Design a protein around this ligand. Structure first.
Ligand code: PAU
Ligand code: PAU
Lengths: 249, 249
């Protein structure tokens, strides 16, 4: 029997099916629930018998998804929930229930793996960064927009900024001053992202020491990884935390 | 005989009335044409006999605004336009007509004043940065969201991000890790802004030399000026450029 795992975001839903402890045998990114069902439909031949997920969407939307999943596979989905502590890590928010569960599971997984102080940055649709002391105490974190959100707002929600995906991709071949809109926007936003990452490293050095472990996750982690040569890039970091939050078998 | 000057952005319209060559005697920030007309007719009437403006809004929106102004004041409004060259400065965009006029006028004004290599950063609704070589050749630039745009896109991204201005203002009293949503977002976004500024300073040092002049403008220049002690903060930089683009009397 295999396990279906999901990371439900506001814009995207990341899923994977694992064999054994954590061997992924299938997965993908869905921009919509219908797209998800379609994706899970083509891989409906896999012997899925368990399910766990983390979500930052409304409780109602998460329930609709859970019910939807329990209709595609013979499972009783486990859903991660807020907590003051998990796996030796203490939630650092004044109101523990306010901390995004995606941030929570990622930072818990990070400390669980490092057993040292660490900086955890998720470069996704939105960007999040959290710091955890060596003793497992979450210091708190930050939230800011990611490339996807910045591009969308400037490209459609402003009046004179227009360019397609092809020129958007070619624009990141250099970070020098742009001589066309796509270049100015893509490079500007990436420099903003890279600058934020450096600010985070500086903050981590001051509060955690220059010996802290650095964890990067999210689809845009590759865009900033050269900035921190020793950083651990872990695409499935949140799923590691999901396993700790929702143990199975 | 005074001059009414305006800078029409995508979210706000900044205006000022000047006496003589450039002495500002009145001004404000309007969120709409109506709010502008309100601001222009609420204070004691001034002898406005000329008007010039720069706009990055659509031509129809601009013509619409001009119609209002020409009815409110006995003037024939001058509207800035794209150019390959102005006041000894050469446009660096491959298609000169695609460069935002606000960016163009600000960078031209900067070089006009310095007659040296310049880094020009506007920290406003949106953030723009342009570099100009000592010989007046615009190298190109960048575009990113400003504090208001970052907050806005995050607000639109998730209903989980909602808080008062009071809470928002209190949150910026420190850049340490946030322990509440307001702190995480405001501090995260500010660190992204501050990080972008440092990336810009590094790019300028590399391409223009360590001795380049730095100009900061925009309402949020206050949030980052501590990073560049020797920077020249000029709130009305774009208007210096407007005077060059649209000379009067
Ligand atoms: C910020 C997001 C949307 C990023 O996925 C998520 O972590 C979230 O909904 N957080 C709740 C607000 C907070 O973490 O302060
Ligand atoms: C980036 C803005 C919106 C800032 O006001 C403006 O400069 C603009 O509409 N520029 C056009 C696109 C460009 O400058 O590449």
């Amino acid at each position: 029997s295999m396990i279906l795992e999901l990371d439900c975001g506001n814009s995207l839903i990341k899923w994977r099916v694992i064999e054994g402890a954590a061997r992924s045998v299938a997965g993908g990114l869905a921009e919509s629930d219908d797209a998800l069902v379609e994706q899970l439909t083509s891989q409906q031949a896999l012997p899925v018998r368990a399910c766990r997920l983390v979500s930052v969407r409304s409780e109602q939307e998460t329930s609709q998804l859970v019910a939807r999943l329990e209709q595609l596979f013979p499972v009783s989905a486990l859903v991660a929930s807020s907590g003051k502590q998990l796996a030796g890590v203490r939630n650092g928010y004044l109101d523990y229930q306010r901390l995004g569960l995606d941030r929570w599971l990622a930072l818990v997984a990070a400390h669980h793996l490092a057993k040292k102080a660490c900086l955890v940055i998720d470069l996704g649709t939105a960007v999040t960064s959290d710091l955890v002391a060596a003793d497992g105490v979450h210091l708190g974190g930050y939230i800011c927009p990611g490339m996807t959100l910045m591009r969308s707002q400037l490209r459609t929600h402003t009046r004179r900024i227009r360019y397609d995906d092809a020129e958007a991709r070619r624009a990141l071949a250099s970070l020098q001053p742009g001589q066309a809109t796509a270049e100015a926007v893509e490079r500007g936003c990436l420099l903003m992202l890279r600058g934020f990452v450096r600010e985070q490293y500086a903050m981590a050095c001051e509060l955690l020491g220059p010996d802290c472990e650095i964890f990067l996750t999210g689809g845009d982690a590759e865009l900033v990884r050269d900035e921190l040569a020793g950083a651990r890039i872990m695409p499935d970091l949140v799923f590691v935390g999901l396993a700790l939050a929702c143990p199975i078998e």
